[PDB]
Amino acid sequence: MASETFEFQAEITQLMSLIINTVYSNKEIFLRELISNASDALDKIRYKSLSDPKQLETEPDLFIRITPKPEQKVLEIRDSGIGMTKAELINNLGTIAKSGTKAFMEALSAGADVSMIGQFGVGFYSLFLVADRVQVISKSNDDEQYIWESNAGGSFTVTLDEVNERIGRGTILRLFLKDDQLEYLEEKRIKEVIKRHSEFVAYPIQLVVTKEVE
Amino acid sequence: MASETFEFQAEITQLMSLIINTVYSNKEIFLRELISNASDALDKIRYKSLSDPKQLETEPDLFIRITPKPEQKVLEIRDSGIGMTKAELINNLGTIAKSGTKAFMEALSAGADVSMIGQFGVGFYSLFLVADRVQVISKSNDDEQYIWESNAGGSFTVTLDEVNERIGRGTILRLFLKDDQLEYLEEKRIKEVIKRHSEFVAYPIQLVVTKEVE
Ligand SMILES: O=C/C1=C\CCOC(=O)c2c(O)cc(O)c(Cl)c2CC(=O)CCCC1
Numbered sequence: 135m136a137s138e139t140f141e142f143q144a145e146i147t148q149l150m151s152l153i154i155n156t157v158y159s160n161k162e163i164f165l166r167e168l169i170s171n172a173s174d175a176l177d178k179i180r181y182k183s184l185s186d187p188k189q190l191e192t193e194p195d196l197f198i199r200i201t202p203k204p205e206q207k208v209l210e211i212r213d214s215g216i217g218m219t220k221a222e223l224i225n226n227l228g229t230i231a232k233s234g235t236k237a238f239m240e241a242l243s244a245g246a247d248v249s250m251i252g253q254f255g256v257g258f259y260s261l262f263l264v265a266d267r268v269q270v271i272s273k274s275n276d277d278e279q280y281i282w283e284s285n286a287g288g289s290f291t292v293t294l295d296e297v298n299e300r301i302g303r304g305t306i307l308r309l310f311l312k313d314d315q316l317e318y319l320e321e322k323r324i325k326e327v328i329k330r331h332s333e334f335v336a337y338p339i340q341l342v343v344t345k346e347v348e
Numbered sequence: 349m350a351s352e353t354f355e356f357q358a359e360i361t362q363l364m365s366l367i368i369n370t371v372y373s374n375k376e377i378f379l380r381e382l383i384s385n386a387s388d389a390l391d392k393i394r395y396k397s398l399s400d401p402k403q404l405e406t407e408p409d410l411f412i413r414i415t416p417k418p419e420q421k422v423l424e425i426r427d428s429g430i431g432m433t434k435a436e437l438i439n440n441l442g443t444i445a446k447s448g449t450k451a452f453m454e455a456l457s458a459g460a461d462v463s464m465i466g467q468f469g470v471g472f473y474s475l476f477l478v479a480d481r482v483q484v485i486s487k488s489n490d491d492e493q494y495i496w497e498s499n500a501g502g503s504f505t506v507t508l509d510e511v512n513e514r515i516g517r518g519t520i521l522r523l524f525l526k527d528d529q530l531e532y533l534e535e536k537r538i539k540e541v542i543k544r545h546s547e548f549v550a551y552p553i554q555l556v557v558t559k560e561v562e
């Protein structure tokens with residue numbers, strides 16, 4: 135299955151570079167930002183379903199789920215929200231939906247905390263604090279399942295998904311963690327971070343843990 | 349992606365019918381049989397790799413993993429063993445590899461315990477004690493990933509896999525549990541059954557648990 139390549143809007147490329155290189159101290163803020171986006175995407179399918187209830191049937195359970203995959207050094211953040219079509223992935227994540235972007239970079243230069251990133255509406259990119267690569271796997275009721283992929287470079291790919299588990303509906307952020315950021319694979323560390331900055335999340339936050347039976 | 353349909357050898361069809369309809373009491377024995385097959389498949393890749401070490405590289409971790417999926421009423425038993433090519437799935441699971449089969453049915457008629465099924469080499473089919481449908485997802489180093497599927501009828505399908513997560517190497521038995529057998533989705537029940545009939549398994553048996561953070 136053939137990938138398509140797209141160019142990032144230039145300011146997004148600049149932002150990713152700022153973020154993936156920054157020695158900023160509180161890298162854990164990425165999880166709050168991603169849970170927040172997850173929650174918003176869920177709000178959206180729930181709101182849409184007020185007038186179109188069958189939109190829920192592709193996945194009636196509304197949840198946020200976090201899945202460490204230690205062997206692959208991967209952390210997945212999944213939700214059963216509204217999801218994104220191919221065109222939404224291209225539009226929302228790369229070729230446009232910007233500044234926010236420029237204004238946040240200006241705030242940064244002036245001394246603003248990276249944690250403000252979500253107030254500028256670009257909190258997604260905070261994932262580069264702990265990951266050097268990301269796959270966004272998404273299924274909207276309106277399209278097939280697709281994979282958007284970026285390594286913080288100036289270009290991203292979008293590929294029809296024939297390799298991942300089917301999601302009924304929603305989105306998975308598959309983070310390929312940096313070698314020094316593997317603590318976010320750890321149950322206790324993950325739990326600690328979640329409890330700290332996400333008390334008023336209306337959806338279940340599920341942690342998937344692998345335990346050896348003895 | 350187009351499925352291919354195959355006919356079961358007739359005695360296998362008879363065995364599945366005996367098993368899926370039986371009111372036998374100790375249905376939990378299926379897990380021992382499947383963990384045993386998992387362990388054997390792992391022995392095989394480990395033995396093969398003695399003289400061909402790179403056979404391990406597609407998935408260097410040797411494990412058995414059990415994953416309840418409550419919403420789908422599914423239980424998955426995964427291993428990173430040798431796996432099966434398309435032709436092996438067809439051969440090993442349906443169109444041949446038999447009696448065992450007939451001899452076990454004869455032993456059953458005479459009064460033998462269903463738990464002897466593994467000593468006749470057909471323990472795989474014990475899964476129909478608790479499931480009315482099964483998908484066997486397999487990746488051998490020698491072939492693409494494939495899905496073999498059966499509902500205990502006289503025919504099964506084999507389909508090139510473009511819908512499930514990639515496994516590096518090995519096999520997943522995806523059991524669609526009967527409505528009265530949902531206890532095997534439960535962490536405590538699963539743990540209890542494992543500990544009982546599998547103390548001398550040389551590989552880690554991992555249980556995947558989903559816990560809501562609070
Ligand atoms: O407020 C929702 C919006 C769209 C709805 C769909 O979004 C999503 O699937 C989604 C998700 O489920 C988890 C995530 O980490 C992210 Cl980055 C996204 C996509 C965005 O948020 C991009 C901007 C649009 C805002």
Ligand SMILES: O=C/C1=C\CCOC(=O)c2c(O)cc(O)c(Cl)c2CC(=O)CCCC1
Nearest residue numbers: 382385386388389427429431432440472519
């Ligand atoms: O002894 C191994 C054999 C083949 C090697 C590969 O088997 C496997 O992938 C495999 C597994 O990983 C888990 C399972 O529940 C089952 Cl049913 C199988 C397939 C069989 O056992 C069928 C008979 C052949 C014996």
